[PDB]
């Protein structure tokens, strides 16, 4: 599955942990409050977070404070509310990691996905 695929949520709906860990891009699944449900190996490779220990933490409050902004969190919340989350933008991740430019794709699951790749 490619980053930004039109039907990416269909493909990932079928996937187990190892399968998610085999993706070419970082993949995070959040509930509507931003708590982390899933977090793959590729994401940990970008961020330095241990995927096994971030599960259950709040993405916006505790893991990724730099994403607590209108440009990221605000877009998440709008898409949770509208029921149509499917949005793509550039961002920089810089909390407890080397500042790293990424592309982000947020999309509602068949739970909400946050997909990340380096740029
Ligand atoms: C800004 O603080 C971003 C941090 C971050 C982004 C994504 C991750 O998976 C974890 C940390």
């Amino acid at each position: 599955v490619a980053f930004g695929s039109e039907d990416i949520e269909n493909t990932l709906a079928k996937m187990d942990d190892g399968q998610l860990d085999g993706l070419a891009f970082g993949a995070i699944q959040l509930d509507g409050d931003g708590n982390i449900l899933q977090y793959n190996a590729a994401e940990g490779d970008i961020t330095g977070r241990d995927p096994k220990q971030v599960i259950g933490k709040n993405f916006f409050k505790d893991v990724a404070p730099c994403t607590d902004s209108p440009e990221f969190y605000g877009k998440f919340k709008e898409g949770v509310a509208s029921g149509n989350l499917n949005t793509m933008f550039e961002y920089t991740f810089d909390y407890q990691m080397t500042p790293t430019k990424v592309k982000v794709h947020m999309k509602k699951a068949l739970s909400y996905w946050v997909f990340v790749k380096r740029v």
Side-chain angles (χ1 to χ4, degrees):
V1 112
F3 182 92
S5 287
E6 104 143 31
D7 67 344
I8 190 169
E9 76 279 8
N10 276 25
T11 300
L12 268 58
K14 294 182 235 159
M15 287 188 168
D16 90 340
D17 285 352
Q19 286 183 293
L20 205 77
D21 285 342
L23 295 168
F25 51 92
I28 307 163
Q29 193 179 226
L30 305 182
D31 67 15
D33 289 335
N35 298 312
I36 295 166
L37 309 176
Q38 303 181 251
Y39 194 103
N40 77 346
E43 184 69 3
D45 289 351
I46 295 169
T47 70
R49 275 55 175 187
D50 183 4
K52 303 300 241 217
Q53 300 300 142
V54 297
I55 304 310
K57 292 188 172 23
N58 190 281
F59 184 80
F60 298 108
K61 176 177 186 313
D62 301 309
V63 178
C66 76
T67 70
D68 180 358
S69 67
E71 291 79 22
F72 195 138
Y73 187 28
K75 287 184 176 179
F76 177 79
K77 68 106 82 228
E78 287 172 359
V80 171
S82 71
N84 190 333
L85 183 63
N86 176 12
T87 192
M88 287 181 69
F89 52 92
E90 297 224 349
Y91 214 76
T92 293
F93 292 172
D94 63 3
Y95 183 65
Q96 302 188 163
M97 51 184 285
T98 299
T100 301
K101 285 186 60 167
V102 297
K103 185 161 15 252
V104 181
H105 178 208
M106 291 186 310
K107 186 153 201 200
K108 184 196 184 276
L110 297 202
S111 309
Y112 308 87
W113 292 106
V114 179
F115 304 119
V116 178
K117 67 168 188 172
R118 297 180 184 263
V119 299

